[PDB]
């Protein structure tokens, strides 16, 4: 198609010249473009030069990229008849890419890597001075396994079944195949991870093309890289962890103190560099991204052992308890907090080097490690590494006392996001940035400063198949104003709005998905609604996303949606744009043909974080009180707009309330503003015009 062909030419010229490009792709028709453009762009140079580094935000997009990549393999193998070196490595979740926890553990928690470290330590201990090896090991590093992938694609599911048949473990296959430089499909939380980005950065060996897919929550991921809430219980886990460290000190000092002195000599002689250069296949700890930290010559507590580290650690956690037991409102400057700490007790600005080393020493002296104590020690260790370094833009904040019991909390505020993304513009080039929910695309040259080119979407045809109306008059124009407050006002008006949702849902009974700015309105209309005929006549049942989302509940709600729409029933999907699961799988009538939006998206205000980042961005780009109520809400609404668009062969309609939507842009800017009662008959005609123009335009 010519429209996507233009984006192919843009990707070509930006990959051949520019080092980074902001490309705006139309929603639903821009996923398969870059996947083939990158491969052909690799074949025109020479077959193995740059590799695809596709980055998504969810796992569903990773699976879609895997099956579409398989469509690329079949596409290139069915048109030429020649077999080439296949690519495609599926890097997914650790719990989903492991087989043993499904045989004995029967758990899908985040502690599967700890059990994997127990098995790996079992292998190392059966190869040194002596649990079993695991299920199958010692044959995952051979050439045959290194060639099972280039000869045949085994990614994720095919790798899970292939490992279940060939009696292998997929974790070491993927880990050993990161250096093979295949098409890696991982998420943003792995490229910028203060524990994963280092090893991945050391295995990919750079020199590739990075593809930022749906790069609209990049600031959200850079924010989520820090901010850890200290909620008084971590102080108890740190106290019990310090007691466990004292017991371990009594154990290593009781009988076996030679290994601690030998490793201590390894620290005095070769320091952290030798300690990390000698150990292989050993569990590591957290770090504030060593490539971004750039701090060498880590001295081990001014050349000291473990008793001094646990003494200064007890003093440090006691100082933390002292700083967390205060009045109520108090803000901290990370420099003033470090100076106050120095006034309490001298410890200098080197507890970072004192944590990254002592944690590894304790690991080298521990054989039975408790998970909660070690986890709390890793939390306090991260807090130390981030009060010792990284201060520009960092802002320690104490949550106020609001009952005062449920209160002693201390959160650290992260720094400028440009710093975190920075290394990719030295490691790499021609980083393609594609997103279908960006409008306007000027807040990415502004916020996050980087020199790039701007390419907007140039595809807009068959406007009769993309019904895009907006509702302004709700029959009284009183719910659009009351539906914009943080706390709802006049419950009777909200009940009238819900009645309007009952009338609208009754008018168009063909799959409805409703998005809310928060769960307060949902919990207010679901308690006592004075009506339920929509569930009793057209919808049979209603689908509600819990304010505390669950994986199995959401999965049963989505499968219930597909089966309900495949039985000719339909169901209303009351979800939150700010909640979990942003979806993205459409291209069928099983999804909501009509989508309802309750006003415009809103972010929770009256929070210390929004004021800290508010004044920070105010000092940075001077975009105060203007972009945090239109850019974020524009992205959250665009997440709902992207679900309506699903190819030109399909149709749909999305109703946006509130006049304030005119102040923001939108994908395909062709919108007509009228009432809701008129939109009922208008949609009643569109449900037939969309069915008439299909065979006429074909």
């Amino acid at each position: 198609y010519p429209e996507q062909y233009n984006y192919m030419c843009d990707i070509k010229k930006t990959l051949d010249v520019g080092g980074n490009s902001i490309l705006e792709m139309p929603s639903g028709t821009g996923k398969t473009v870059s996947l083939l453009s990158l491969t052909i762009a690799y074949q025109m140079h020479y077959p193995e030069h740059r590799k695809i580094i596709y980055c998504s935000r969810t796992m569903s997009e990773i699976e879609k990229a895997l099956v579409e990549l398989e469509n690329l393999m079949d596409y290139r193998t069915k048109e030429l008849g020649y077999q080439e070196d296949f690519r495609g490595l599926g890097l997914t979740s650790r719990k989903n890419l492991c087989l043993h926890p499904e045989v004995s553990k029967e758990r899908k928690g985040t502690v599967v890597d700890e059990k994997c470290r127990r098995m790996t330590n079992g292998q190392a201990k059966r190869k040194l001075e002596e649990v079993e090896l695991c299920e199958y090991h010692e044959n995952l590093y051979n050439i045959e396994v290194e060639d099972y992938l280039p000869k045949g694609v085994f990614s994720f599911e095919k790798l899970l079944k292939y490992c279940e048949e060939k009696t292998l473990c997929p974790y070491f296959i993927v880990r050993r195949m990161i250096s093979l430089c295949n098409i890696i499909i991982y998420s943003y939380h792995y490229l910028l991870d203060p524990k994963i980005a280092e090893r991945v950065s050391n295995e990919v060996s750079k020199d590739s093309i990075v593809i930022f897919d749906e790069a609209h929550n990049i600031d959200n991921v850079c924010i989520e890289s820090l901010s850890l809430d200290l909620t008084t219980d971590a102080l108890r886990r740190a106290t019990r962890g310090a007691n466990a460290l004292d017991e371990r000190i009594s154990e290593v000092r009781k009988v076996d103190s030679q290994k601690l002195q030998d490793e201590y000599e390894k620290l005095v002689q070769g320091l952290x560099x030798x300690x990390x250069x000698x150990x292989x296949x050993x569990x590591x700890x957290x770090x504030x991204x060593x490539x971004x930290x750039x701090x060498x010559x880590x001295x081990x507590x001014x050349x000291x052992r473990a008793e001094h580290f646990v003494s200064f650690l007890k003093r440090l956690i006691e100082y933390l308890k002292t700083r967390m037991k205060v009045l109520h409102v108090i803000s901290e400057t990370p420099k003033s907090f470090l100076q106050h700490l120095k006034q309490l007790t001298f410890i200098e600005r080197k507890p970072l080097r004192f944590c990254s080393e002592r944690l590894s020493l304790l690991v080298r002296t521990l054989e039975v490690t408790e998970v909660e104590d070690f986890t709390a020690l890793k939390d306090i260790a991260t807090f130390a590494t981030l009060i010792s370094t990284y201060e520009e833009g960092f802002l320690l904040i104490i949550e106020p006392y609001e009952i005062a019991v449920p209160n002693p909390i201390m959160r650290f505020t992260c720094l400028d996001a440009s710093i975190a993304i920075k290394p990719v513009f030295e490691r790499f080039s021609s980083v393609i940035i594609t997103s279908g929910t960006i409008s306007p695309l000027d807040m990415y040259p502004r916020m996050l400063n980087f020199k790039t080119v701007l390419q907007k979407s140039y595809a807009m045809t068959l406007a009769k198949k993309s019904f895009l109306p907006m509702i302004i008059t709700k029959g009284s124009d009183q719910v659009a104003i009351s539906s914009r407050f943080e706390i709802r006002n006049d419950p009777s008006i909200v009940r009238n709005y819900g009645s309007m949702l009952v009338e609208f849902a009754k008018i168009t009974p063909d799959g409805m998905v409703v998005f809310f700015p928060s769960y307060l309105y949902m919990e207010s209309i679901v308690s006592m609604w004075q009506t339920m005929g929509i569930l009793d006549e057209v919808w049979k049942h209603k689908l509600i996303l819990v304010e505390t989302p669950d994986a199995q509940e959401t999965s049963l709600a989505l499968e219930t949606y597909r089966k309900a729409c495949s039985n000719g029933r339909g169901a209303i999907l009351l979800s939150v744009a700010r909640g979990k699961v942003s979806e993205g799988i459409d291209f069928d009538h099983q999804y909501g043909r009509t989508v309802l939006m309750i006003g415009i998206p809103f972010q929770y205000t009256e929070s210390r974080i929004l004021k800290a980042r508010l004044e920070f961005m105010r000092e940075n780009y001077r975009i105060r009180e203007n972009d945090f109520l239109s850019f974020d809400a524009m992205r959250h609404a665009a997440q709902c707009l992207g679900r309506v668009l699903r190819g030109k062969d399909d149709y749909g309609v999305m109703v946006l309330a509130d006049r304030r939507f005119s102040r923001k842009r939108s994908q395909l800017p062709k919108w007509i503003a009228q009432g809701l009662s008129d939109a009922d008959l208008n949609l009643s005609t569109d449900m037939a015009i969309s069915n008439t123009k299909q065979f006429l335009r074909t």
Binding site: X299, X302, X303, X304, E307, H308, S311, K314, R315, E318, Y319, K321, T322, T345, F346
Partner: protein
């Protein structure tokens, strides 16, 4: 604790706890105001904290935010010995090895003081304090 803060005034929570609870550095024992004031007011005698025999002196008290007696003693002795050693042969030229070795020696001295060993090495550390003070006077 809320159940022990003075052998006579161990439970003053329902009596409007408006009095502080001082701790003498030569006892490490909590005594409420109305008791300790009479203690050092009638003469420097020992407190009856669970049969305590160490003499409580007049004044020379301190406010405690409670960081355990071990860490409080280690930070008091730590600061005192840190002031006795001062900065002798520290930032004199910029060396990192000998500096960290001397800091290791100082922290080992503070360790031997907070542990006590057998009341033999600590006396040698006291003679080291007199020697360092003699070097600071000159």
């Amino acid at each position: 604790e809320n159940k022990d803060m003075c052998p006579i005034c161990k439970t003053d929570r329902y009596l409007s706890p408006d009095v502080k609870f001082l701790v003498n550095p030569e006892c490490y024992h909590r005594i409420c105001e109305s008791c300790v004031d009479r203690i050092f007011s009638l003469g420097p005698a020992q407190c009856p904290y669970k049969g305590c025999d160490k003499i409580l002196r007049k004044n020379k008290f301190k406010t405690q935010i409670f960081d355990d007696v071990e860490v409080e003693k280690e930070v008091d002795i730590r600061k005192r010995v840190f002031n006795v050693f001062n900065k002798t042969i520290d930032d004199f030229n910029g060396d990192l090895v000998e500096y960290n070795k001397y800091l290791e020696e100082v922290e080992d001295i503070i360790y031997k003081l907070d542990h006590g060993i057998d009341v033999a090495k600590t006396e040698e550390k006291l003679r080291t304090y007199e020697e360092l003070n003699k070097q600071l006077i000159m």
